[PDB]
Write a protein that binds this DNA or RNA. Structure first.
Lengths: 61, 324, 178, 51
RNA sequence: GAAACCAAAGUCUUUGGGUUCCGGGGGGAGUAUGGUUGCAAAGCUGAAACUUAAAGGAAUUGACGGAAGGGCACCACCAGG
């Protein structure tokens, strides 16, 4: 199962070398699940993503 | 080379014991803990600094001596010679920035190899990490030779130095033509299967690390980086090594592969991934130990008595008198 | 509908009175619970109503107000309202070590240190909040964080100096994959 | 009784012999340290030098 | 008052209210011996030979932290050429 995504707000830069971006993700399954994920590469406010799995949640707390 | 063999051992081991607790060792500690000869040790240290055995260190107040790399190498070689392992030196230098290869010959004349770990904050961390690397490398060679892998026989080790079995040959990179590529290639996947069976995956299994003993035997060395198969990335390292060997064989010898082993078999072999009742003699020994302890404390507190400050004060007083 | 009552001591009456609106506003807005302060029994009483959103919010409110009464700041128990995995281990100082009189007081001192700084230092390493009652120590945080803070505090009141405590707790935080 | 009492007096006798042994060890160590200090003092006074 | 500090550790070279115990550079050493008490453990009294240019007490700055926080650099890294 592959689910579509959306960028709501870019939060910050995480990782050892500052290579990852911690971002907030809104779902295109008409749900309001805003889940905080980690992405690699350049992202801006308004980008659209392809998640291989959605049940995993990134590093929160 | 060495000519006199009386007290450089004791002074240099005193320096080694000084390095184990702190950076720069004063001469008072050396004179206290090397007490066989007294008074003449200053000229001994003056004789050592004419070589690259020890080095002086007097910046602004700290005044001491430290051990160099060559002094540590000669200390290990002297400890090997005490074990009757090295008599003469073969000058076939394998000059690497991570390790130095020196041929050695025993009293019998049989030649062995000598690996001296040179790792490149000051050099005490370099020597300590060289010691740890030599220890873990000797442990890995012992494990691999116990598991009958085609590796040389380990012989001895002293604190960075490894006396190791000598097998002559060339690495697989600089051998342009191989008469029988298929047999040694099948043996290469056999060794890959054996390593993966032994709960181990190399990660950087390179052709440069493979030495062709007369282009007939495979010699394998250099295991400080050896990792586990319990890691989730283990099969990715294993497949990287397999594809590296494959692309090297279809790229360099123009020989195409016939067998394609992609087996992860753990762990059907040994898991190497972790790898007046008291007699008077005792009374005499204990009382002698006590009195040597008080006299060693006395020697410490007597040898701990900066003349540079007194010289500067005298010069300042003389300048104040001659200028005013 | 069910309710929980929690008591308040005499020394905690005035902080309850001053911070009252900051207490009952998130209880009544986000959780949707009825709250009062019975002056005769001196108990903060919180009950569920018809427009309560979900179950277990009453326990969140009880944890919030009880953490405030134990000595934690109102924001540090608002953290109990929002977060799920936060707990409260509390223990007496004389539990691990039998201390009598002035020695016991000195133990309290080396939980605070100079200016409270040592205490705050633990709050930077274990990511917890800690409250010192007269002979009691309360820790609020995650489970492994509470255990880390408890080991640090017990190391402090067995005689170990703060330098060893900082070094050990920073090493344990380093191995904790934080 | 007559069993617990026997066990207790056996432990008491063992302790008494143990204390006698410890006292003997202390006096032997003191005597040997004294004579070795005398020998070290004799070394300090004479038989110390080059010629 | 050497000071931290102390209404006493004050009323001291402007030095005397009565009186008891007790110290004389650091070790040897609270050791040996002797006496005395104790079932014992040991308690009380208690040296010398010799060794040593020092040992200590208060405060004053802060190389060096294996103490912690920030900031900067493709002569550092990340993704790459």
């Amino acid at each position: 199962p592959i689910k579509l995504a959306r960028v709501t707000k870019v939060l910050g830069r995480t990782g050892s070398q500052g290579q990852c971006t911690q971002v907030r993700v809104e779902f295109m399954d008409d749900t309001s699940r805003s889940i905080i994920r980690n992405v690699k590469g350049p992202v801006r406010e308004g980008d659209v993503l392809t998640l291989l799995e959605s049940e995993r949640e990134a590093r929160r707390l | 080379l060495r000519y006199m063999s009386r007290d450089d051992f004791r002074v240099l081991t005193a320096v080694e014991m000084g390095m184990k607790n702190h950076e720069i060792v004063p001469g008072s500690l050396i004179a206290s803990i090397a007490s066989l000869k007294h008074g003449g040790c200053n000229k001994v240290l003056r004789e050592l600094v004419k070589h690259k055995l020890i080095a002086w260190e007097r910046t602004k107040t700290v005044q001491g001596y430290r051990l160099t790399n060559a002094g540590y190498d000669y200390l290990a070689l002297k400890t090997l010679s005490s074990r009757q392992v090295v008599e003469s030196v073969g000058n076939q230098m394998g000059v690497g920035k991570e390790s130095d290869i020196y041929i050695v010959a025993n009293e019998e004349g049989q030649q062995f190899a000598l690996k001296l770990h040179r790792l490149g904050r000051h050099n005490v961390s370099w020597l300590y990490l060289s010691r740890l690397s030599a220890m873990k490398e000797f442990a890995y060679m012992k494990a691999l030779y116990e598991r009958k892998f085609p590796v040389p026989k380990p012989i001895d080790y002293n604190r960075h130095a490894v006396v190791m079995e000598l097998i002559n040959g060339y690495p697989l990179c600089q051998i342009h033509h191989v008469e029988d590529p298929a047999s040694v290639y099948d043996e290469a996947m056999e060794l890959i299967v054996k390593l993966a069976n032994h709960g181990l995956i190399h990660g950087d299994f390179n052709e440069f690390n493979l030495i062709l003993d007369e282009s007939d035997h495979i010699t394998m060395i250099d295991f400080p980086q050896m990792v586990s198969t319990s890691h989730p990335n283990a099969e990715w390292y294993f497949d990287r090594d397999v594809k590296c060997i494959k692309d090297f064989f279809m790229k360099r010898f123009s020989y195409e592969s016939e067998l394609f082993p992609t087996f992860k078999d753990i762990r059907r072999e040994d898991t190497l991934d972790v790898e007046s009742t008291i007699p008077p003699e005792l009374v005499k020994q204990k009382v002698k130990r006590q009195l040597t302890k008080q006299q060693k404390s006395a020697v410490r507190r007597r040898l701990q008595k900066a003349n540079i400050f007194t010289k500067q004060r005298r010069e300042n007083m003389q300048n104040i008198k001659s200028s005013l | 509908e069910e309710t929980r009552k929690i008591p308040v001591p005499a020394n905690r009456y005035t902080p309850l009175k001053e911070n009252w609106m900051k207490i009952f506003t998130p209880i009544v807005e986000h959780l949707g619970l009825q709250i009062r302060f019975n002056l005769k029994s001196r108990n903060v009483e919180i009950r569920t109503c018809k427009e309560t959103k979900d179950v277990s919010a009453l326990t969140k409110a009880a944890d919030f107000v009880k953490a405030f009464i134990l000595g934690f700041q109102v924001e540090d128990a608002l953290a109990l309202i929002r977060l799920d995995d936060l707990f409260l281990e509390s223990f007496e100082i004389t539990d691990v070590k039998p201390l009598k009189g002035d020695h016991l007081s000195r133990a309290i001192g080396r939980i605070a240190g100079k200016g409270g700084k040592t205490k705050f230092t633990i709050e930077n390493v274990t990511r917890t909040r800690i409250v010192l009652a007269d002979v009691k120590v309360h820790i609020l945080g995650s489970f492994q964080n509470i255990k880390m803070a408890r080991t640090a505090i017990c190391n402090l009141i067995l005689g170990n100096p703060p330098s060893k405590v900082y070094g050990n707790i920073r090493a344990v935080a380093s191995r904790s994959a934080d | 009784k007559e069993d617990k009492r026997a066990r207790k007096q056996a432990i008491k006798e063992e302790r008494k012999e143990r204390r006698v042994e410890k006292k003997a060890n202390k006096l032997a160590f003191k005597l040997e340290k004294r004579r070795q200090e005398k020998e070290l003092l004799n070394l300090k006074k004479n038989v110390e030098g080059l010629k």
